[PDB]
């Protein structure tokens, strides 16, 4: 729509990623590559609120952003991911999520949202953009035959609804996670996906703060591929622009003037996967197009970096109880540490293979 949340705003740079990057860059031995690595701390990323323990940091980021804006005469914008559903990651082998449906998951998740809202409420001069619950709704489209997902459906819908409804009250601009071209972009998945997203939008009152959808989060697809990646055979929507061009009109037709954001943080190198479903620490990935509202599409508000490159997707150690065997595949960089922890060699390659170059 006419209101692109990023226009006229300075994005607050994640202090946590900045510290990870600074520690990483000092370990890189080549001076030029080290300088390029250090500059990554100046590229805006999303901060993942993957547990209640992250909420105090959110409060500090909002207050820091408010003061930076006043000091520089700018309006500041903080980028967050809401990522703490009960029975999170229902189609994965295991999950690190602190809440379970069986132990008051709904109420605990609502309290997590309430704590986030209570922070955001205190800093009305800071804009907030939130990606809502990566993987969750996409799993409800294609993975209902996973019994954990089938059993989680009502909780996921109620929790996502609670998040949308209550974050809207503090004016947060929200993009529901919507998988990627190889997940929901298959032509046959577009209508079931559109029907689900539209129902979620309706249940949350069609708030204008529910801007649309986020795609490619934590994935590696091109926004606009020079030629189709071989993993995409059978799907005419072989990149994110094809997916979004196909899905956006279905949402519009339902009355939702929906726009999109697209993760490109690990999309600099294409044609690095054996299978489209391979998602874990894909070897040879490079940093991709840096965040910008110059997206080339009427449907896309911004290219963004949602998943922070260098933070691991999962361990390759089969003895870990958090182990997911996708993290031991051939196209997966190994050995790899636990999910979320820093993967230094992977970061160094992300820097070295960045496209455009850093």
Author numbering: 82 to 439
Publication excerpt:
Cellobiohydrolases (EC 3.2.1.91), which hydrolyze cellulose to cellobiose (a β-1,4-linked d-glucose dimer), are key members of their enzyme cocktails, playing a major role in the hydrolysis of crystalline cellulose. The catalytic site is located in a tunnel enclosed by a pair of loops (residues 174–178 and 390–425), designated here as the N-terminal and C-terminal loops.
X-ray data sets were collected from a PcCel6A crystal and a pNPG3-soaked crystal to 1.2 and 2.1 Å resolution, respectively. Two major conformations of the loops are known, an ‘open’ conformation that makes the subsites more accessible and a ‘closed’ conformation for arrangement of the catalytic site residues into the catalytically competent configuration. In the cellobiose-bound structure, the loops adopted the closed conformation, in contrast to the open conformation observed in the apo structure. The residues in the loops have consistently high B factors compared with other regions of the protein. In the C-terminal loop region, on the other hand, the r.m.s.d. values between the apo and cellobiose-bound structures were similar to that between the two conformations of the apo structure. Therefore, both loops showed clear flexibility, but their mobility and response to ligand binding were different.
